[PDB]
Amino acid sequence: ARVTVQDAVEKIGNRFDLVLVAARRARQMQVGGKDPLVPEENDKTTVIALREIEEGLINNQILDVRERQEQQE
Amino acid sequence: EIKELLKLGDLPTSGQIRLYDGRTGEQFERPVTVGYMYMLKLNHLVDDKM
Amino acid sequence: REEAVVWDILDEVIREHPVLLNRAPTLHRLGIQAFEPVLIEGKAIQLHPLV
Amino acid sequence: KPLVGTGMERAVAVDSGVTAVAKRGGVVQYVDASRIVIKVNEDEMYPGEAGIDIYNLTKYTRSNQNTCINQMPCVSLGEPVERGDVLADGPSTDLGELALGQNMRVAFMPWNGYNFEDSILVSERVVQEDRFTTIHIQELACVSRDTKLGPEEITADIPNVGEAALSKLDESGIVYIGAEVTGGDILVGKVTPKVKDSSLRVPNGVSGTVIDVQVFTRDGVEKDKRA
Amino acid sequence: EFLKPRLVDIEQVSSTHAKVTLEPLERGFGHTLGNALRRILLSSMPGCAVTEVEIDGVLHEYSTKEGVQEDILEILLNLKGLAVRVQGKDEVILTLNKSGIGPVTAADITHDGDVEIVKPQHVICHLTDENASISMRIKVQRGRGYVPASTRIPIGRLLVDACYSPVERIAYNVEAARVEQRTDLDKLVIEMETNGTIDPEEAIRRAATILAEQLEAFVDL
Amino acid sequence: SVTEFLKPRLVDIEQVSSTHAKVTLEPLERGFGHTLGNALRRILLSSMPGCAVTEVEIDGVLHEYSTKEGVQEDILEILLNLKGLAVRVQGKDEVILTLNKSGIGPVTAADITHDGDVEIVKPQHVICHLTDENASISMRIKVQRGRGYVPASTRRLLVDACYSPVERIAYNVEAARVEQRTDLDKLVIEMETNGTIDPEEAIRRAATILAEQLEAFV
Amino acid sequence: QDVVLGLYYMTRDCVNAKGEGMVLTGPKEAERLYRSGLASLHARVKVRIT
């Protein structure tokens, strides 16, 4: 259940870092592991990734810190 | 001549008969042009296309 | 065979997957857009009128 | 029978010879879907070599846009006819008048936006009266060549197929006339000798019912029981 | 406190169709129950359309039998134009056997008990020969709405379209009732058309039954 | 299978807080969503047993286009505000009330005399404004029971009595599918009332009326 | 084309019909009047909006 991606662009104004950040996170949530931090509505990880964008808790920085820490572990 | 042929029939002269929806079941305003058109089917059928 | 279970699977796999719609003489960039499908009986694409 | 005609349907329906044009007038003795027998009036008819006439109607057969071309009798039994007139109605002809589509009750009002750009809306009454119902005829072909490692057999023995796929065939592998065929079943069992199935099936997504089977064979080969 | 109507009048104004009358009704109920009953009486009624006909000398539906003038397809449409009444069964088989030169109407069908023909003078087809006899067996079953043969789908059993509808033409006109020491009483006049298979009292009663069940869907009785 | 129709049961009532109502029904037979929508719409619209304001006189005004000082508003405007007034009444048919008050401030519905039977449902609603220390307001409001929307010309300053508690009634029809089912209908009742009754009970009252009107049949 | 025709028909002012010259507290009862038939679709009326 998602119609517009306007607020996602309001949180990341570049609109192309939107695509890369959402795609990187949704790939890391698709095939295995690293569970979504939002309740889902029986919808695919595309809408889940954009929804977690519009909750603000996903950008390039969170992926940087988490991938770096998974490298450190 | 069309007005005369209509006057032979029971239909009004302007040909605009009042009609009624099936959903609302009430009268449309501004009575409408109905009639009998000769129509044709063309050979662009959908299961040929799809 | 198109059995009883496959249609529910199809309604699973559509629900949030866009498609591209495209009139063939593509003049400008509104010649191609994206839409979320909703399954309709019949054999012809229903399309939102304003677009 | 088109309502608002032009008066030009008569000459079209006469000269485009899809109908049964009476070469001589008279009285119709025998009417059939197959044929019409014409007893000629006496003054219209030669003393020597006299006889009568018989018009063979052209039955259900393939068109050239894969539509239906067929004739149907329009004259009742025991009836005066005039020389140079129709005797049977063909495709889109009625009583000697060219009737392409149908007259229908029609209305001009915007109805819920279903008629948005140019969209003609049709009530279910029209399809219930079966009056845009039309007939298509497809000519499915299958050939039996001869290449290396053997000829192309027309048997029914087909590897790895269901018996329901076999059940709409004869003992030989050609479908019976009258089978309500479905999209994907086998009409003719064609095998490639190696051995592998490449038999003729229905083009995918159409219904149909077989009306006729033509079979041709090059000279030098025996024929099976259905041929 | 509203005044409930009763089935005040049934008038068989013709052999095909009849008018019924609803009286008395209050303001607003006129178009309400008029549109409601019209839409139900067109939508879903019982019916006795023809479904499957097995003509003996026929392989497939596009052949032409020797001795009948029309196509077999036009014979199938003329069978579609048939009207028949049953009472107690959901399906039945009929029988037609006739030869000789003459029209072939439904009055020559074997007239078995609960099977009833209401338009006997309707023509099926004509013949041309002394000795060429059509012979068909007709399955007639109950049903509702429209069932084309592509949906629900022997080599002799032909399939025709299902035309489950007892009616074609339904109308309703509201007007005032009697004085009766209270004005604004609305006289509902329903003018329907019937081929002759469903009695109009039975029709309006089944319509009320269906719409009452659809209100039963959430409110209690 | 000729008597059977797919009886729906209400899948959810997405009700919003007080009087906004979105009631859904599925699955329905081909066509019946519109007849249920039209039946419930016309019955809730024109015939609901309810009560409203009928006629109000001003003790110092004998004309519609007039004014009393100390009031920011006009008497036509307070006719609008009294049409907005919402009252449930005991089974007595009519009773007169009033608005006798001398005081600076907005005049609310709670500052009406309570008068036993009559229960005002919205005390937060404000009728008119008074501002002067000696401008007194006094009028005679007369409620009545009835079953429709009665305008002025169909009938002291008159009030059109919106007896039906509903304020907006509307319905859309979308497609809803069951297993192999081609085209089955779905009723979506979106509806607002005045808050004198909860909306689902109003739906059941309308259905009860039409149920009696069919109880005469079968 | 169609929806603009419907809107242009929906906002215009005929000089007189049913409901011309009364007052209404809200657009909800305006829709309730038009679905009733106890008024015009369109008549110059003083209402309250917000």
- Alpha-carbon distance between the two ends of chain B: 47 Å
By DSSP (H or I, 4+ residues per run), the number of helices of chain B equals: 2
Strand portion of chain C: 15-25%
Taking the alpha carbons of the first and last residues of chain C, their distance comes to 36 Å
- SS element count, helices of chain C: 1
Please trace the helix and strand order of chain B, writing H or E for each element.
Answer: HEEH
Number of strands of chain C: 2
Percentage of residues in helical conformation of chain C: 10-25%
By secondary-structure content and strand pairing, the structural class of chain C works out as alpha+beta
Function (chain D): DNA-dependent RNA polymerase (RNAP) catalyzes the transcription of DNA into RNA using the four ribonucleoside triphosphates as substrates.
Family (chain D): Belongs to the RNA polymerase beta chain family.
Protein name (chain D): DNA-directed RNA polymerase subunit beta
Keywords (chain A): DNA-directed RNA polymerase, Nucleotidyltransferase, Transcription, Transferase
Topology:
The structure is cut from a larger assembly and holds 1 copy of chain A (73 residues), 2 copies of chain B, 2 copies of chain C and 2 copies of chain E.
Chain B: H1 2-8, E1 16-17, E2 32-39, H2 46-49
Antiparallel strand pairs in B: 1-2
Chain C: H1 6-14, E1 19-22, E2 32-35
Antiparallel strand pairs in C: 1-2
Chain E: E1 6-11, E2 18-25, H1 29-43, E3 50-55, H2 72-80, E4 84-85, E5 91-98, E6 103-105, E7 116-117, E8 123-126, E9 134-141, H3 149-152, E10 158-159, E11 167-176, E12 186-194, H4 200-216
Antiparallel strand pairs in E: 1-2, 2-12, 3-9, 3-10, 4-7, 5-9, 6-8, 11-12
Helix pairs in contact in E: 1-4
